[model samples]
Target chain A: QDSLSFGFPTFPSDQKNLIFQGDAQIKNNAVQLTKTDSNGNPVASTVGRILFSAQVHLWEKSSSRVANFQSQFSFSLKSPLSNGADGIAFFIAPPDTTIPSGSGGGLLGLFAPGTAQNTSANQVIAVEFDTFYAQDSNTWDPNYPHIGIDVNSIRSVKTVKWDRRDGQSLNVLVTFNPSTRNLDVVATYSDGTRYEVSYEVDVRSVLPEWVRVGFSAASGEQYQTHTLESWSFTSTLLYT
Target chain B: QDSLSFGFPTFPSDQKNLIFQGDAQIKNNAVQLTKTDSNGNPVASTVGRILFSAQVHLWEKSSSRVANFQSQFSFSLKSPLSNGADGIAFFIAPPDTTIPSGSGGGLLGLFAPGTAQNTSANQVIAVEFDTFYAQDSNTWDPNYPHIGIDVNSIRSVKTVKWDRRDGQSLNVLVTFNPSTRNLDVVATYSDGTRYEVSYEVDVRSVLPEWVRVGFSAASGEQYQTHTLESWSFTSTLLYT
Candidate 1:
């Protein structure tokens, strides 16, 4: 005759570490989110947040499954993604695993594999804030890359390094509050303040809220190694 | 010869009888003059003048050939005709037969013919300042019944119409000073006060200036018959 009902965030924590194997993976979570179809539109979502992380290795061998694999993220419908990404996101693309284990092609290409527009989405939108663009972080150019928005995912908006610039961002904070069904995408400065307005995304229309999240890092032939450590998501679930 | 060279108006001129057998007749006079294109454009010489006892009838089973015919003249392009008889003027158009006879249909089928948008250049354009709209003139609409400008000559640029409402016999005078190449088209009224303008036409462009000029008449299914009696033309041939 138990009367108390177990609530969320209070139950024993559930964690998952999934290494994506090529095609695409789906890890169901309590948050409402969904993956986009081929048209880069969202499917149906009944629950919460989806964190998708993909590690893109820049291996330069010929027998790589992701030989020309350019990493990209396609969002589901519902909450529409803007032309540029001001929020920290992930690229869940096919694996570019080629060459030696740690041959890393470019920062996003895992240091060894080469990436170009051919590998990017021609009709998709991408939001990227690249970190390693040829070198100088103080100067922004096509070579010294950093985090910025990349739609059509793999194709870059700009190759220039962007961080600590005028009213810009390197750290992206995108959250979907299930209690309100509102997705907020915010761009933050290295300091503790957000430089750009928090973009609103309607999660029911955008990405499915329950998908696996992974980490991807790349370091190319001559560029510095880019690292994507651990990533996590926290959201208030309106329903279980 | 010296005495016949010039004479003042002393003797009274007699009446002349001009007639058209069937539907068409030839004018012993009525030479050609030069004229320009473009609306509101004036010409240097008038071919000749005719005096009709009664209003002449001209009909067209077809319509106008000129693309923008009405805008040039108010459908009635000449100085008003006088002497109370039907007015007189020239015409330009392509050749077409089988027009209705009498008032409803002009001798040559000048009014209410085929269609105004017809591809034929045979409708009419010169001048007619008459009082009666006659048989077919009723079908042309615009209350533009009695008389109008009918330039039936297939050629262009050298034809025009001028009318004076008074009547009797309107004198159309053609003058061109050989030395200056300047021509003027003038229509004289009974009061001696007159209407005149000079015209310049390219002969090679507007060919076959010679055409029949006579009266064609019809009362109506309800009215009676009338006749166009006489006409004449005097020219001052210029030499280089």
Candidate 2:
């Protein structure tokens, strides 16, 4: 089939396509990225990162050497206090289990400081939901909480303020069309507001033919709960 | 090799062992049982029911003919208004997709009226979190919201008042140790309180050797959103 779909409420006993690393655990029928101990202590460090790894070959090779894909999912960030730190992302990375060390907090567990200067270096494409707003001008961060598209860097190329309510139903949709080489994103809230943006990128220039797609999340000085409630993806394999 | 386990943040693409029936959909990474339509109307009827099905042979059939299993999951009930109706349950039922018609409201979707007079006839086991309290005297319901253990019926054999916070993390643990045929339950809340109870039931008498396990939820005259956030199960097959 050209599509993949799955959701929660029951344990994923039949699905073997996922691999978990770092402090992530499946709890409460959702993927929990960070948690506090019985005494309310976080298990993840400021630089800790957790990953949910998917299969390397999402689409069959095709003659055009390109693939078109779309994905949708619901997620939530539950913070014990207002304004949770660090954040989460949907990423396509090389198929590997290793999360870079010292890569938590504002890094969102995907990269380290001073790394990811180029596409060939980090080899990651991600859309980040960042909670921290850096006051410094040297970083690519926006002035407010936001969502942005990043190519192997915490610094976002396109950004928008984070306005969705916590503990409410939040839905996200992403689509990549090979012909247009445009990546579009739309986020819908329970209150019926939708935020959207699009970016131009050629997949063959940034990603390998077969790459793993999954979620990564982390916390910094502040902590929050990052959860994926449901997800669906569809892709067409491309062969050159 | 005898046990299976998995939990959330990612959708289970391999867990084909599950069967979803009735008015249920996977959204927000959780099993969302009730949701409002685009027009702001509930998709489920006042008596709607939903089910999640799992494989039955969790414990192998051996000379001992018993099984040891444990399950823990988080759930929440959110109503557009306060005090939602009906309830939710974790159940073991015959392998089928048919939910009893008119099985909403107090029925909780497991039994039809005038049926399940005894254990053998009903052949279903469940633990329910019921939200309604009947003012009349004829129903077997408690005077307040409660959690109960039921066999083939909505009327709980053992019950405790509902004390967990709504829209907060509510954790439930159910364990079955076949050596003594003991079934124990513990419900924990985010605020650090736990409710516990136990009962003894011989599985061979109440369930087929191979059956299905999953969750069922419903709403009555008053509607509420019942969501299973995360769930994990570990089981050993017995070869007695």
Candidate 3:
């Protein structure tokens, strides 16, 4: 379950020389997002895959504010008998009732409604690849969660329908450069070569423009502990 | 609490019918939605004040389906100090939520999520003259709610940021008519003059031919219920 090699070799396809790698952990109300250059300068992850538990909180660090976020979990297994993990997603949301708590779905397992996470803040947005869809007594058609953008609370802004690939490891390439304010992410299968989608995220739109990026993750009853292979992140704002 | 009428005499010279009028009871899972004449048949409303209590459920109609709606609600000066019960709005959702559940300000108090009554479905698109801003842990912004459109529950696609005239008995006219098979809503407001704002709702690329329209209301902590004045509606389903 612990490996440094990613399914994709040449990531951050644009800059081979500037890539960093490392592990991410969460404590207090913050995530200890760390990364290092090939020279190992005790910094943070910037340009690579960062993995963690399925459901956790991630944030963006502005010069003044810490953007609160909680990752959503999901599960989509074409073959539930041989079900593979569908993984989770990264989101930047306002501290409200919409924060993911825990559910077994590919999106945030629970935080959507079961918790008191209010979703009235404008500074909240989420990029998610959810897999589980549960039909509560109040739900009409609750089965499959789509690859979507959740804003405010669990209000899905855009959801692109996707069929569960089942029993396969998920690999997504999220390239964030704080300097350029460009956060590009590619969601795909671990094997690559098929069914991949990329988004050019405007982190400034998700969080405040002055905020730096942070990482976090969490998991619930559906799975055990989540792990990370590698993560590379950098920010313009440094800790005093 | 009932039967109070006053003559408009004359509206502003520049004012015209923006939304229209209609009446829909808050019963049934999904009502047989359609437009009718002033005689209560199936004609169309000549632009006038409108009100409604409805939701936008995207999943109920395969993402590709859409519906247009307009309504008129009862107005009274004796009403609670909260909202003199101005007007209501027309919405198009996936059939997964309800007509203004007091959550996240309930998208301008136009959705009830617990009953799957108003705005919880997959592709909900709505524009409301919401007079109530309820408190919940799931709010996206903590400010008092204003008039706005909630798309996919992510962004306030467009907002009518203004205040209602006090004791004037506010009545709003909302239209959920989609043109390009998209979740496009054209809303006309009545003030000194009639003003219209249309938002291109980003839901399923291709939508169905029609949608459901309804309304919901609350007098905040001060008033216990809402009332409708009079209403009529119709559709000119344009397929271009």
Candidate 4:
């Protein structure tokens, strides 16, 4: 096929073409990427990840052509107590990829304590909408709630402070251009707060020909309820 | 198919799946990558390139798996002048690729003057069998006849002076292991001098999924008759 596309306005009961991991589930018609407390409150110290089950060919070797894609998902994060502890991420991984063992606490669920700033074993490209600001250089996070683009590790290649609204639904649009080797993300929270980040990356370098796309989120010492209301993706099969 | 394999003991008149360009042709049952002078001596200031017609899927996006490959080509380089002025290269490029405009003289025919050290437009990974030692930093060449692993540009990512014996037929075995991200080249010139070079490279970073593989060669201010007597290649389709 020349194109591959999928959407989930609300997750189906069967969760077709979707795989959930780390306590994530389809609840209240949304993909809940994080869990709750004993009293149905936002729980602390948890991580959730979900992926599109089928592999997407990022490039076809025979054709020397790469696929361009655009993806958007509607999501919400909120905490009944303090601010939502962590954040959410849209990530790309190898076809045979798996979550890092002992995925980090509130690390966008992309890296482990050992994989931080790592180049081998953990190959990933992601865009994250962060609600927590980390001061540690090891984490390589920004000083404010920000949006960042990550290479293989948690340290973003580039980041920007993206205002996070309290208990608001947000829409994130991510687009990739193969010719330009640019991956761009636009996060629009509620109606107004628009945050953006862009980076030039050759996916083939970080991944093989095929790959899985997914969402990852976490709640740390603080916690929050994270939900995916809708998601859609479209990618070109071959273009000059 | 789970694997892709092909070989040429000598060029068939029909040239089957081979595509030749820039004055290259089949002569004396061999693929001649450069031309001769009035006295049937090696000519100067020229280049030749040939590629496999079919694209090889280096990695399949659906499987998130990469293909490992091994290639060997028997070649002869000779010059009646001071020296055989150029070199030959086994290179990987995007499927829709074409020879660089004004490809460099004696540059393994991989880059153009406009593309020296260039990152954009020219994305290639190659193993070069160099005849002339270049002194320019822009060319990033070593002082002796060497073997190099080139990235996007002609300046090899890593290089080693592999003694180039005069007027000898050589068998170069080049192998790539995706799991280790290593590309190793072993040049057995005649029977005794076995010059080898190895480097870690993520091909996907330098190339797209589908790619064309073949030989590139050139003759410069000095020149040589460069010929490929036999060539063979084999690659796995989807190995974990």
Report the Cα lDDT for residue B118, model 1: 41
By TM-score, the best candidate is 4
Q: Write the per-residue lDDT of candidate 1 for residues A1-240, one digit (tens) a residue.
A: 000011121111132223332122342322212233565433321111222221222121222111111121222112232221112235322333222233222223222223333333222223444433443322222554344444333444433334434223235554434344333345555566543322233333322222223333322222221112223332222331
Error of 3 at B204 (Å): 4.6
What part of the reference interface contacts, as a 0 to 1 fraction, does candidate 2 reproduce?
0.00
**Ranking, TM-score, top scorer first:** 4, 2, 3, 1
lDDT of 2 at A104: 73
Give the per-residue lDDT digits (tens) of candidate 2, residues B17-134.
2466767666655676555566534444643333333344544343344667777778888666566767788887666646877677677777776673454458788998888777
Whole-model Cα lDDT of every candidate shown, in order: 0.29, 0.66, 0.35, 0.76
Q: Model 1 over residues B1-240: C-alpha lDDT tens digits?
A: 000001111111221222222322222122111122244222322122221211111211122111101101111122222222222334433223223323232222343444432424443444443333333444332233232433333122343343334214444544334344444556555668565454443221332322223333332222211222223322211223
What is the TM-score (0 to 1) of candidate 4?
Answer: 0.49
Taken in order, the candidates have interface RMSDs of: 62.1, 11.8, 31.3, 15.5
At residue B125, give the lDDT of candidate 3: 55
lDDT of 2 by residue, A114-219 (tens): 6844544677888887876766522667778888888756667677777736677678999988778888989989878988877898777677656667778888
* Better TM-score candidate (1, 4): 4
What's the CA error at residue B192 for candidate 2, in Å? 0.4
Query: Which has the better DockQ: candidate 3, or candidate 4?
Result: 4
Model 1, which residues run further than 4 Å from truth? A1-240, B1-19, B23-112, B115-119, B123-125, B132-149, B152-167, B174-185, B196-210, B215-218, B221-230, B234-240
Classify candidate 4 by CAPRI docking class.
incorrect
Q: Which residue runs of candidate 2 sit more than 4 Å off their true CA positions?
A: A1-240, B9-17, B39-54, B58-62, B116-118
Deviation from native of the Cα of residue A120 in model 4, angstroms? 3.6
Per-candidate TM-score, first chain only?
A: 0.36, 0.85, 0.44, 0.93
Determine the backbone clash count of candidate 3.
Answer: 115
Candidate 3 per-residue lDDT, tens place, A117-218, comes to: 454434554555554444542142235646555544454555665555644444545444443433444556655633333344444445543221222333
